[PDB]
Design a protein around this ligand. Structure first.
Ligand SMILES: CC(C)(C)c1ccc(Cc2ccncc2C(=O)NNC(=O)/C=C/C(=O)O)cc1
Ligand code: NI
Length: 434
């Protein structure tokens, strides 16, 4: 059953209506030639300045480079995490170089145009579903807060897998569901390419299959120069999708409702600010002393610590994003500061855990409360320091993955060592002690 359809087959349009009716396709006419123009140089503007980057992802246990170059434009302070990798937004000119400032702006226009299109589609989708058997839900599933711009030149990048279930040709992006979206939220894409049985291998497509199902014939939508398609509602969860490479270079602007409830700057700042509620905070120095050693406060402390380190600092310093935009340099330098003080708190606790006159029963309580996070912290320091210095990250330019923050045991500037194995095996020792 290696079968697919395209508009060349008449079966295709009914297989469309009653398998994938949550796929929408508005041809380039639904977009002014003035909007096409402004957007298509916003792509080049961004591509000239060299903003886009292949991503060093990690799927299952293996590190891979993404065939596609990618940049993320969106609400300032917002982030989109996929494949264990967090992208940070190059911000666009909403509430609050010369070229870049206007490029990010264009897409915000693009983004607002699409958002309108997505609402009527979704109003028309609830309407078909009233003639047979809330409109703020619908507005919220269309409030795109970010767009992931995608680029590929099929000629400068001729290392492509073939589509295995249906024979759709080579793939610029393999079968997948989109991660980290608001539930039932829509995804809208502007596709921008340059210039007999099966699908046409010179032209770009988006593929679609039912999950778990390589029998029902896939779909293969042709995408030409300013075409748009929309994934409505549960589509991205009921269906897998892919991209099928054409012959010419191609941009795509893919607009999402990223689920950044724990993936925004204002959120991770506030966790730090809560963590540091246990710090006697009169003056910023390294006489870190803590108000409480209540075991729930310490646990919460050490957990926020891990989150800023691994979810924010290590994720950021695995990337660069320092060409078009610099928005994150202050915030990042400020989370390093908060992170560093916390390494002090952890120090404070280790001292407390070992103080002469603390009845072991209370020291076993402090331990048991903090051991998990301090052991998780070690294991991720390894996974990072490995994934960082996999020799696949030396090949990348001087423009390649830092392993940061990293200090070395003969570094009086850091209170505890970077390798906690002795400290943690030493904690576990006490707890088992009779
Ligand atoms: C092969 C490997 C490198 C593991 C890989 C596989 C799939 C993806 C795609 C992906 C996964 C999770 N969340 C979002 C995506 C993603 O980038 N979706 N964007 C698109 O499908 C864009 C389609 C289009 O260009 O219109 C990215 C990377
Ligand atoms: Ni996708």
């Amino acid at each position: 059953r290696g079968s697919h359809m395209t508009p060349k087959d008449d079966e295709f349009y009914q297989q469309w209506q009653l398998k994938y009716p949550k796929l929408i396709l508005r041809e380039a006419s639904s977009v002014s030639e003035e909007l096409h123009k402004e957007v298509q140089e916003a792509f080049l503007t961004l591509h000239k300045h060299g903003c886009l980057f292949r991503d060093l992802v990690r799927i299952q246990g293996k590190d891979l480079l993404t065939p596609v170059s990618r940049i993320l434009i969106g609400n300032p302070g917002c982030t989109y995490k996929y494949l264990n990798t967090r992208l940070f937004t190059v911000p666009w000119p909403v509430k609050g170089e010369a070229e870049i400032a206007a490029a990010c702006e264009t897409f915000l226009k693009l983004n607002d145009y699409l958002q309108i299109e997505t609402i009527q589609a979704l109003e028309e989708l609830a309407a078909k579903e009233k003639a047979n058997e809330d409109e703020v839900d619908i507005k919220s599933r269309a409030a795109y807060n970010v767009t992931l711009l995608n680029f590929m030149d099929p000629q400068k990048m001729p290392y492509l897998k073939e589509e295995p279930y249906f024979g759709m040709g080579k793939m610029a992006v393999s079968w997948h569901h989109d991660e980290n979206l608001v539930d039932r939220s829509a995804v809208a894409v502007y596709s921008y390419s340059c210039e007999l049985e099966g699908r046409d291998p010179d032209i770009w497509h988006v593929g679609f299959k039912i999950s778990w199902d390589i029998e029902t014939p896939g779909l293969a939508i042709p995408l030409h120069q300013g075409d748009c398609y929309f994934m409505l509602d549960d589509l991205n969860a009921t269906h897998q999708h892919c991209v099928l490479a054409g012959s010419q270079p191609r941009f795509s602007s893919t607009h999402r409702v990223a689920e950044c409830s724990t993936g925004t700057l204002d959120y991770i700042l506030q966790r730090c600010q809560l963590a540091l509620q246990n710090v006697c905070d009169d003056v910023d120095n390294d006489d870190v002393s803590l108000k409480s050693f209540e075991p729930a406060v310490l646990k919460q402390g050490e957990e926020i610590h891990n989150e800023v380190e691994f979810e924010w600092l290590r994720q950021f310093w695995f990337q660069r994003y320092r060409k078009c935009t610099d928005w994150w340099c202050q915030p990042m330098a400020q989370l390093e500061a908060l992170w560093k003080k916390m390494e002090g708190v952890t120090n404070a606790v280790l001292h407390e855990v070992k103080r002469e006159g603390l009845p072991v029963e209370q020291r076993n309580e402090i331990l048991t409360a903090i051991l998990a996070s301090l052991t998780a912290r070690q294991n991720l320091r390894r996974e990072w320091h490995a994934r960082c210095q996999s020799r696949i990250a030396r090949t990348l330019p001087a423009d390649k993955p830092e392993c940061r923050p990293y200090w070395e045991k003969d570094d009086a500037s850091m209170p505890l060592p970077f390798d906690l194995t002795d400290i943690v095996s030493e904690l576990r020792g006490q707890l088992l002690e009779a």
